[PDB]
Amino acid sequence: HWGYGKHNGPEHWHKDFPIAKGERQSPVDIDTHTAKYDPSLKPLSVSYDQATSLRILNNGHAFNVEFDDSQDKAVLKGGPLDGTYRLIQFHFHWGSLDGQGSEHTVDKKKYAAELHLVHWNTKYGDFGKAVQQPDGLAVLGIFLKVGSAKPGLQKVVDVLDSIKTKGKSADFTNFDPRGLLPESLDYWTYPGSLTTPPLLECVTWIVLKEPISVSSEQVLKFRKLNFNGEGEPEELMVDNWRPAQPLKNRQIKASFK
Numbered sequence: 001h002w003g004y005g006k007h008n009g010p011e012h013w014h015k016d017f018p019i020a021k022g023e024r025q026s027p028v029d030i031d032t033h034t035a036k037y038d039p040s041l042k043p044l045s046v047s048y049d050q051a052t053s054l055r056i057l058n059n060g061h062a063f064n065v066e067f068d069d070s071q072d073k074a075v076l077k078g079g080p081l082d083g084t085y086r087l088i089q090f091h092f093h094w095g096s097l098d099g100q101g102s103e104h105t106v107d108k109k110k111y112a113a114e115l116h117l118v119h120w121n122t123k124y125g126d127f128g129k130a131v132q133q134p135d136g137l138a139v140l141g142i143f144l145k146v147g148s149a150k151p152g153l154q155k156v157v158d159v160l161d162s163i164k165t166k167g168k169s170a171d172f173t174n175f176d177p178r179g180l181l182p183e184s185l186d187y188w189t190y191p192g193s194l195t196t197p198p199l200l201e202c203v204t205w206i207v208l209k210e211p212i213s214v215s216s217e218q219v220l221k222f223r224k225l226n227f228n229g230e231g232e233p234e235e236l237m238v239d240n241w242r243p244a245q246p247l248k249n250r251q252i253k254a255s256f257k
């Protein structure tokens with residue numbers, strides 16, 4: 001099955017998931033000079049005050065911090081979005097080295113990592129239905145650079161030892177995702193896809209311009225995770241990012257001048 005290795009990595013995915021070569025695949029390079037300011041973009045609304053985290057899971061390709069999405073608690077709206085999108089999970093993609101790891105790039109620049117806060121459109125009732133719709137998901141993407149520590153990330157970092165291998169989970173309640181956001185909510189937005197198989201073309205991407213800073217020690221602990229299950233040969237969970245895909249017939253819009 002698919003992964004990020006030499007023989008099952010992104011260049012292989014199209015054989016099982018032909019949509020890999022589709023018309024609105026993600027991630028993409030964000031050419032900042034070609035992106036156009038769109039004054040019709042409403043302000044972005046991130047309402048995470050009632051967020052209820054439940055669990056953190058190593059799923060063999062990343063780790064997911066999962067939320068209770070059975071009520072409108074933590075929601076994303078405004079910006080390019082019509083209606084209300086409910087937070088279901090967040091996860092990261094990261095590199096083996098600080099110079100790579102992000103999925104989106106900015107004028108071909110790669111960041112050390114990228115945070116994805118995944119939301120689904122409540123008009124479709126559940127997440128499984130939402131991924132079958134062109135406007136089913138909204139993913140808020142946030143770049144990570146290495147510098148000062150992000151205090152709000154440390155609780156995530158310290159539980160990773162308990163979910164080292166594929167299929168392990170741990171209770172992870174009362175985590176506040178507001179601690180992972182940068183100061184500015186300036187963003188780029190474009191229509192795209194899941195960046196992992198099945199690569200469904202159901203995502204409105206909202207990528208923040210301002211990165212957050214995390215420490216070398218924090219990202220080093222990401223890199224101690226395992227792709228493998230317990231009692232299997234160790235393969236470090238690093239470079240779990242898909243590279244930039246062709247933009248094709250799409251325009252990236254900016255929320256800012």
Ligand SMILES: [Zn+2]
Nearest residue numbers: 091093116195
């Ligand atoms: Zn992702």
